[PDB]
Amino acid sequence: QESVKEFLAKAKEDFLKKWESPAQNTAHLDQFERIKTLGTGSFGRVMLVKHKETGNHYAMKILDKQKVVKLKQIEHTLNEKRILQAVNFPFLVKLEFSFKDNSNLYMVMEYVPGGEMFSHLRRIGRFSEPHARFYAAQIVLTFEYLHSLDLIYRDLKPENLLIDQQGYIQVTDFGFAKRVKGRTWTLCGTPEYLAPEIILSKGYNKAVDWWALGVLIYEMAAGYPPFFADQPIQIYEKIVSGKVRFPSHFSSDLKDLLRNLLQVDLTKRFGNLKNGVNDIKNHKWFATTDWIAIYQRKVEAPFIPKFKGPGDTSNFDDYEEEEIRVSINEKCGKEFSEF
Fold it and tell me: What protein family does this chain belong to?
């Protein structure tokens, strides 16, 4: 416990230095060769690229400034980059470079070829309780780290959990990550993973991450999320109801933990009590977990993604290659001046 406290203090000092003096403009597009588009969204894309000089592969997130403004994701994109450049933890994907041009914002990250947990979960069906516990433990440590720096993550789901070549998690997408002391109000996340207090719209705190952990653990072990319905409105009804139905194969301990994580009133929810993360870390379901060994990656992973070489992308879906448009005129200069 003393080694944790001492680790987190050093980590806060490290974070705050970089938080106060953010790295900017540490590379340029011309330094990278495009290999393949790994994914697309409403205001950007992520591409596999090769750094021309070193031959190292990276995952490059490219965001269209005009589209970020239109979808009102300005502050969110600024948060993402500022937080990512300042954090350092094994289970967070490392931001190696960032920069911008006339048209786009760029975040070059370590490439994780194993793909998203979500795809592996669908292929396998459901994880064993020992299997789920392995992943969950890493998320518990990751939140313990993030919350210690007053950071809420807010985008937990298996889609955002990449599996590295050691079979350990790397969390990607900090679009909803925010530094806040106390409460915040933005309606954001994924309907299946939203805490009641987000839906209720009265404001909320880091306790929403612990709720989402409850959802993640359920989804991992059951093969499907605890609150599912045809339409978001019906999903939200189930969430705020205070009712969960657990599969028969769920251990008594697992159910107890999920009852305490999927706790509707944020003042009785595990991880938001006076005793914080220890209520989770010391829970019976985790009695077998060696938290230090997990941090170190000394625990045998349940599954190692097949490596198929550098620049192989078989763990990702296919996407048509579209142009990377760079305008001659600077766009949205003011809005993204801090990037």
Answer: Belongs to the protein kinase superfamily. AGC Ser/Thr protein kinase family. cAMP subfamily.
